[PDB]
Amino acid sequence: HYPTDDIKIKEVKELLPPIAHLYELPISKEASGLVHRTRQEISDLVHGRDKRLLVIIGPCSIHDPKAALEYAERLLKLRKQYENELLIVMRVYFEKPRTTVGWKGLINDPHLDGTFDINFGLRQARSLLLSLNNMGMPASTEFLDMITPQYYADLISWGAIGARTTESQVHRALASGLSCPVGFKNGTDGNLKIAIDAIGAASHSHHFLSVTKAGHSAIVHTGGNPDCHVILRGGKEPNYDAEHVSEAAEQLRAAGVTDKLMIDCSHANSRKDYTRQMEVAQDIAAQLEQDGGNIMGVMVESHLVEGRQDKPEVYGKSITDACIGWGATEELLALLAGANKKRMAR
Amino acid sequence: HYPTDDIKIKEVKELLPPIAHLYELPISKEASGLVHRTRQEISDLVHGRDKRLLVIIGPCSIHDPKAALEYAERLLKLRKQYENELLIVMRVYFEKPRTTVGWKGLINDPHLDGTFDINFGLRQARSLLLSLNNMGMPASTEFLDMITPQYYADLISWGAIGARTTESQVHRALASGLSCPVGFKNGTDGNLKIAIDAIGAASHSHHFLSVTKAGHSAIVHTGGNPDCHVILRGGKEPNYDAEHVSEAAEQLRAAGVTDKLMIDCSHANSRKDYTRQMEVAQDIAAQLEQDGGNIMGVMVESHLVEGRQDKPEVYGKSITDACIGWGATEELLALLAGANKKRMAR
Amino acid sequence: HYPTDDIKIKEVKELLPPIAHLYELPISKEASGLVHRTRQEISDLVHGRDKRLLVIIGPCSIHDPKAALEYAERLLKLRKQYENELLIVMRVYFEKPRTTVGWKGLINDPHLDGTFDINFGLRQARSLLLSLNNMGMPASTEFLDMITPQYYADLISWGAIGARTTESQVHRALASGLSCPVGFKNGTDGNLKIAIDAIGAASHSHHFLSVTKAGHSAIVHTGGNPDCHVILRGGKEPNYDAEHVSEAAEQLRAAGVTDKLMIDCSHANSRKDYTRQMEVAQDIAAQLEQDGGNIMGVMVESHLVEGRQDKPEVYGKSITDACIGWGATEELLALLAGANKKRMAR
Amino acid sequence: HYPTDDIKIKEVKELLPPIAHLYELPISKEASGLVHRTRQEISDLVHGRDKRLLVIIGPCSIHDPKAALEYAERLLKLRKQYENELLIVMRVYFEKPRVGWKGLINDPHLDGTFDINFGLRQARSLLLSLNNMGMPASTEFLDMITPQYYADLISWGAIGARTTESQVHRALASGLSCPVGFKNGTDGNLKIAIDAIGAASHSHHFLSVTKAGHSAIVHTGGNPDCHVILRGGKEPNYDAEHVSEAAEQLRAAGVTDKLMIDCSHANSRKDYTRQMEVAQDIAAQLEQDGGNIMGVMVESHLVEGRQDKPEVYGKSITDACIGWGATEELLALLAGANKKRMAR
Numbered sequence A, B, C: 001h002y003p004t005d006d007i008k009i010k011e012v013k014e015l016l017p018p019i020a021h022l023y024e025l026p027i028s029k030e031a032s033g034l035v036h037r038t039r040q041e042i043s044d045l046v047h048g049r050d051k052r053l054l055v056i057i058g059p060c061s062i063h064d065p066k067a068a069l070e071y072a073e074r075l076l077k078l079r080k081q082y083e084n085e086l087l088i089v090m091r092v093y094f095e096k097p098r099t100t101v102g103w104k105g106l107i108n109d110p111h112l113d114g115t116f117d118i119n120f121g122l123r124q125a126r127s128l129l130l131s132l133n134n135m136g137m138p139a140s141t142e143f144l145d146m147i148t149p150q151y152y153a154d155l156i157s158w159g160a161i162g163a164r165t166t167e168s169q170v171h172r173a174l175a176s177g178l179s180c181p182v183g184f185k186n187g188t189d190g191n192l193k194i195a196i197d198a199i200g201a202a203s204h205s206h207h208f209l210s211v212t213k214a215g216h217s218a219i220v221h222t223g224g225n226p227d228c229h230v231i232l233r234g235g236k237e238p239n240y241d242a243e244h245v246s247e248a249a250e251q252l253r254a255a256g257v258t259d260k261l262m263i264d265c266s267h268a269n270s271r272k273d274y275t276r277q278m279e280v281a282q283d284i285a286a287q288l289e290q291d292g293g294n295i296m297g298v299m300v301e302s303h304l305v306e307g308r309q310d311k312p313e314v315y316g317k318s319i320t321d322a323c324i325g326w327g328a329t330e331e332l333l334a335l336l337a338g339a340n341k342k343r344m345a346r
Numbered sequence D: 001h002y003p004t005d006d007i008k009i010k011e012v013k014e015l016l017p018p019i020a021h022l023y024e025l026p027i028s029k030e031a032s033g034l035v036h037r038t039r040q041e042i043s044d045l046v047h048g049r050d051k052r053l054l055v056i057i058g059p060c061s062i063h064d065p066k067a068a069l070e071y072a073e074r075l076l077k078l079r080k081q082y083e084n085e086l087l088i089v090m091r092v093y094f095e096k097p098r099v100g101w102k103g104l105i106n107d108p109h110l111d112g113t114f115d116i117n118f119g120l121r122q123a124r125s126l127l128l129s130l131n132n133m134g135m136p137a138s139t140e141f142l143d144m145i146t147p148q149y150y151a152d153l154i155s156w157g158a159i160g161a162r163t164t165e166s167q168v169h170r171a172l173a174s175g176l177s178c179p180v181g182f183k184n185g186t187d188g189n190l191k192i193a194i195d196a197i198g199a200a201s202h203s204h205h206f207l208s209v210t211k212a213g214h215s216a217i218v219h220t221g222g223n224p225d226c227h228v229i230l231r232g233g234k235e236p237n238y239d240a241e242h243v244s245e246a247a248e249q250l251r252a253a254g255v256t257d258k259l260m261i262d263c264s265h266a267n268s269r270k271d272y273t274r275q276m277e278v279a280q281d282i283a284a285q286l287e288q289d290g291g292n293i294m295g296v297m298v299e300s301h302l303v304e305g306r307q308d309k310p311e312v313y314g315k316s317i318t319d320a321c322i323g324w325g326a327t328e329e330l331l332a333l334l335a336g337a338n339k340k341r342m343a344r
C-alpha cells in the first residue's frame, strides 16, 4: 500500500472536549442573566426597537487576562454611567487573524512562545469570559471556526464573523446557529454585498459539521439567526461617513434586511492609525446629532495604555494593533454618549 | 437561571467516526497506487516538469452514484486514449455551495428528499470514491469544511477550495495539510490576489481544529502544501483568454509562486451557459496551439445528458449547474488533446 | 520526571464503537421477535410456568461461521420437531477461557493465526448471531467482560457467567443488567454458594463501568435481573445426579430464589470425556421420568463431527473441548424429548 | 420491532474521560519519583533482593479524604522511622465489594446520588495529595476502566479473593504498572492465586478505554512482579505451617515463593481486635525464620471499630479497623521482629 492519508500532517492531537471545560467552569446564574438580557438588548438595537448605541470596545487582542480584567473594571463604571445612551460591551478577541507569520493568539498560543497549548488557551479563554460576565461586563468575540464556539459561546453576548469569512458558506451556517446576535464585516476590498447576502443567509436554517459538547464528531442543525447586521470596516476607501452609511442603508432595504448597521472606528477606517479613531467617532457623533437613524453601533480598539509593542513588556499595552489609551477612551465615550443623548431625545 | 447555550440550534447529533467508514471501505492496494501516482503526476504539472493538461471534468454535483459510475466508465476510456496529452481526473463534488433553499448535496441529503441522513451520505461518498479509484478513475472534490476531509481525503487526487472560501484563514490552513494538490479559485468578483495569497499561505505550517479518525475534537498541525495553484473562473467578465492568462501569469511570477494555472470553462467563464464551455475550450486550444505555456489545466462541467433539471427525473442529468452532455464531452476532449499534442511537440 | 503510566502496556488501540456494528448489522424485525419471545419462554422455565426443558447445545467454541450455520440448519429441524417438549437454543460461545498457550477465540483471533483483529472478530460474531436469529435459531453465549455485551447482547436469548467469574462483583453487576436470562455456574472446585449468592445479587440494581453504544466511557445503572438460575457443572465430584439436584434445590429455596436449575452434561460432569455426555444425559432423562421437577435445562457440547483437533483441519470438528457428533446429537435429543414428555404429562 | 436492547438498564451515562482528570491533576515530578521508586522497591521484595517487610496498612475503605490525609500524616512518621525494617504503603481502597454504600468513586457524597465524575476526581486528587506528601498508595482494582483514571498514582495493586480466578482480571494485572498481589480464594483456595501469578506474567489482550475515553483493545507486556496474599478461608492461614505449605506450592509452580499475609478479614475472623494477635504470630515467625514472608496487610484507622453511618470522624463505615494507638504498637512489633530477621 502506498500511503495516502495525512501525508502533509505533522501531528493530530486530541483536545479536551467542551464538557471538560464546562464542568470546571459552569455558567453562573448571574452570568446567565447578563448574557440573556444583553443579547435581547442587542436584538432591540438591530431591529430599531431601541436607539441606544451599541459600543464594542476593548483591546485589539487579549494577551493578558489580568490586564483584561483591570480594563473591564474601568470600563464597567462607564458602562453603567452611560447606560441610557450607550450599551457598552467589552471586546474580547483572542487573536488577530493573519494567515502569515505572527502570534496566533491566546487560545492557540497562550504562552506567547509558539507551543500551541490549546487546552490551556481554551481554559483561559473560558475563565476570563466567565469572570467578566460575573463582574457585570458582557463580552463580545469573533468566531473563526465551527468548533471553538462549543467551548465558550454560552458566555458571548455579540459575535463577529470576519471580512475574510463573510462569504464562506460554512461560516454563514455557523452564524445561523449562534446564540448571540452576529455582525458581518464588509469585504476586504470594501464589498458590501457579501455582508448583506450573509445576513439573509444566516436567517435560515442550515446544517454544518462540528463536535458535540462531549467532543465527538457531529452534525448541527440550526434554527436561523434573525439578529444579524453589517459592520462597515472600510475597503478601497473609508466607509464611515454619512454618504457611505446612507448608501449601505439603501442596499440593505433593497435586500429586505435590517438597515441598522455598525461602524468600525478602527482598522481601515482609521487608516490603521489609532490616533484617528477619535476622528471617525467625531464624524459619527455629528451624524447622530444631524440624524444618524441607520447607526446602531460602533467598534473601538482601546486598552489601559495606548500604542502597541511587539512583545508583552508594558502592562496593558497591545501586542497586535495599536489602541487608544484610557484617557482617550473616556473622551471618545463621553463624546458618543453626548451626541446619542440628543438623537434619542427626538 | 436563563438559558444561554444552543438557543438557535434544532439538533446536535453525533456521527459515526471516520474509523467506522474506513473499516467498511478501506483503501485497496490498487487505489492507493492510483492516488499516490496521480498526486505526483499533478505535482509535476503544477511545477512545470510535465506539459500534459490536467482535465478536471464531470458533473457539477454527484446526486446519483450509479450514474456517476457509468460516466466514469466512459470517461476512463478517454483518460487512457489521451494519456500522453491529457491527465483526466473525474469531478466528484458532493454539493454546490448555494445560498438558496435547495438540495444540500449527497453528503447532507443522499436520499434527495430532505431527510438529512449524513451517516449514509458520508458512507455513499466514500463508497463511490473507492469504486472510482478501483476502476482506474482518479477523483477530485471541493472541501467545504475542516471535518469532511477526515472521512474521504485519502481517496482524493486533487482538491479545490472555492471562490467563496479561498480568502478564509481556516480554509487556507486546511489546504496546507491536504494530502492532495490544491487549486484555489479567484474571487467571485475576479480578484486574483486572494488566490495568490492563498498559495503562499498554504505552503506553510498551520494549526486548525478538526477531529481525529476516532472522531474526537482535535488540533491539527500541518506541514504545508507545496502543490497549490490558482484557478481562473471568471468575475465581472470572463478571464480565460490569452490577455487574462498573461496578466494572471505576470502576477503569479511577481508573487514568487507557480505561474502555471488552471482555467474553469464553466461557472462565470461561461456566464452560466453550458453551451459556452465548448467556446471557452476552443479559445484555450487556440492558446495551446500558439503558445499557452502558463496553462496546466482546465475544468469542465460534463455529464451523460446535457443541461439541468430541478428534480432528478432524467438519468444522468444534473440537478445543480447545467452540464454539457456525453457527445459534446467527446468533442471537447478530442479538441484539447489535439491542441496539447502540438504544444507538447514544440 | 520518571514514567508511571502504561509501563507494562504494548499498545492501546481504539476499537470501532458498538454503534458502528449496529449500523451495518441492525437487528431485523424477525430476529427481534425471536429474541424477545425466546427470552420470555426461557423466563417461564426459570420460574416454573412451563415445564419444557431448555437445551443449550452446540460447539464448545465457534471457530468457523460456515460450519456453525450448517449446524444451525440441522439443529433447527430438531428445535421445531421437539418444540412441545424441548426449547432448543444454540450454543454460540466465542472463546474458551484457558490459562494455557491457546487460541484466544473468534473475537480475539478470527483469522486463527495469532493475529488479534478484534474489530473483525466482533463483526464476525455479530454477523453470525444475526444470521442465526434470522434463520429461526436463537442463540446463547458467555459474557466474559463488561464491554463485549454492547456489541451483540441484543441478539442473545440466554447468557452464562462462567465458573471463574460467578463470584466476581462486577460480573454479577453485569448480569443484573443483561437483557437475557442468565445462568450462573457453580465454582471450579464445586462451590454452589457462589452461584446462589449470585442469583440473589443479580436481582438487584447495580452500577458498573462500560462504554456507551457510541463507544465512550460510561457508568451503567441496572434495573436488576429476575431471571437468573444456577448451572451444575461439577467440581471435585460430578454433580448431575438426583442427590446433587435435591441438595441444590434445598439450598436454593433456603435462599428464597428459584429452585429450578440447569445441568451441564459436559466439562467437569463428563470429566472432559465427550463420550460421557450421553451417560450424563441418560441419568437426567431417568430423573425426568421419575420426578425431575427441579430441572429446567441442560447443556451439551455438540458439533457436526465428534472429537477435537489442535488445528482447524477437519470441517465442523472442535478445536477447543471435544464434542459429540451429529448422530449422537440426534440420539441425545430424542432421549431428552421422550423423557421430558413424561414429566410434562404428569 | 419487539425491544431487545437494554431492557433491564435504567441509564447509561457517558463519563468525563481520563484525560480531563489528568489535565486538572497531572502527576507531579515528586509524586512520579516516589511511585517509580516504591514500585521498584516492592519488586525487590517480591523477588527476595531486599528483606524489608511490605506493610499495606490503612482504612478498610476511604469515605472521607480529610481523615485519610490526617491518617497519612501520622503514618508517614512511622514510614520514615521504620524505613530500614518496613516498607510502609497506605491502603487507599475506595470500595468494599459486598447492599450498602457503593464506595467513594460511585457515591462520593455518601447519600446515594452516584456522582461518579466527582468520585473519580476525588479519588485522583486524594492519591496525588498522598504521593505529594511522601506517602505511597495502594488500592484494589475491581474493574478494567478505573485504572485509566488513577493507576499512574498507585505503587501496589491488589486483585481480591472474588476476582483472582477471573480471566479478565488476570489480564488487567498483566498490564498494571504496579506490582500486584493476588488473594487466595474465599474458601481458602491457594491454587487460583498461584495460577494468577503465572497467567499475569504473560501478555494479554482485554477491552478498556483510551485515555480519551474511547472503547479500546489493550495489549499488555506481562507483569513479572506478582505474588500471593494469604487471607484465610475455611480456617485462618497466617501461621507457620500454613506459610510453609504455601511456599512449597509456589516453588512447585516456579513462581516467587515470597508472599503477603493479611492480618484482617478472614484471618482475624472478621474481628478487628484479633489483628494484633495475627501480627504477633507473624512477628514470632520473623524472629525464628520466616524467610518466605515479604509483607503483611492491616486494616487501621484513626479511631478503632466501625459504624453504620459516618457520624464519628476517622472511624470506618465498612470493615472494622484497629485505632491509631494499636497501629503504633503493631508497627513497632513488626519493625522489631524484622530487624532481627534482616540481621541474620
Ligand SMILES: N[C@@H](Cc1ccccc1)C(=O)O
Pocket (backbone or CB within 6 Å): A146, A147, A149, A150, A153, A154, A177, A178, A179, A180, A210, A211, A220, B004, B005, B006, B007, B009, B012
Ligand atoms: N453552542 C453554540 C452554537 C453551536 C453549536 C454547535 C456547534 C457550534 C456552535 C451557541 O450556543 O451559540
Ligand SMILES: N[C@@H](Cc1ccccc1)C(=O)O
Pocket (backbone or CB within 6 Å): A004, A005, A006, A007, A009, A012, B146, B147, B149, B150, B153, B154, B177, B178, B179, B180, B210, B211, B220
Ligand atoms: N486526512 C487529510 C488531512 C486532514 C487531517 C485532519 C483534519 C483535516 C484534514 C488528508 O489526508 O488530506
Ligand SMILES: N[C@@H](Cc1ccccc1)C(=O)O
Pocket (backbone or CB within 6 Å): C146, C147, C149, C150, C153, C154, C177, C178, C179, C180, C210, C211, C220, D004, D005, D006, D007, D009, D012
Ligand atoms: N446492552 C446489554 C446491557 C449492557 C449495557 C451496557 C453495558 C453492558 C451491558 C443488554 O441489552 O443486555
Ligand SMILES: N[C@@H](Cc1ccccc1)C(=O)O
Pocket (backbone or CB within 6 Å): C004, C005, C006, C007, C009, C012, D144, D145, D147, D148, D151, D152, D175, D176, D177, D178, D208, D209, D218
Ligand atoms: N494505565 C494502567 C494500565 C492500563 C491501561 C489500559 C487499561 C487498563 C489498565 C497502568 O498504568 O497501570
Ligand SMILES: [Cl-]
Pocket (backbone or CB within 6 Å): A162, A163, A164, A185
Ligand atoms: Cl476581518
Ligand SMILES: [Cl-]
Pocket (backbone or CB within 6 Å): A264, A299
Ligand atoms: Cl474587528
Ligand SMILES: [Cl-]
Pocket (backbone or CB within 6 Å): B163, B185, B233, B267, B268
Ligand atoms: Cl466557481
Ligand SMILES: [Mn+2]
Pocket (backbone or CB within 6 Å): A060, A061, A096, A267, A301, A320, A321
Ligand atoms: Mn485589531
Ligand SMILES: [Mn+2]
Pocket (backbone or CB within 6 Å): B060, B061, B096, B267, B301, B320, B321
Ligand atoms: Mn457547478
Ligand SMILES: [Mn+2]
Pocket (backbone or CB within 6 Å): C060, C061, C096, C267, C301, C320, C321
Ligand atoms: Mn467447553
Ligand SMILES: [Mn+2]
Pocket (backbone or CB within 6 Å): D060, D061, D096, D265, D299, D318, D319
Ligand atoms: Mn476490609
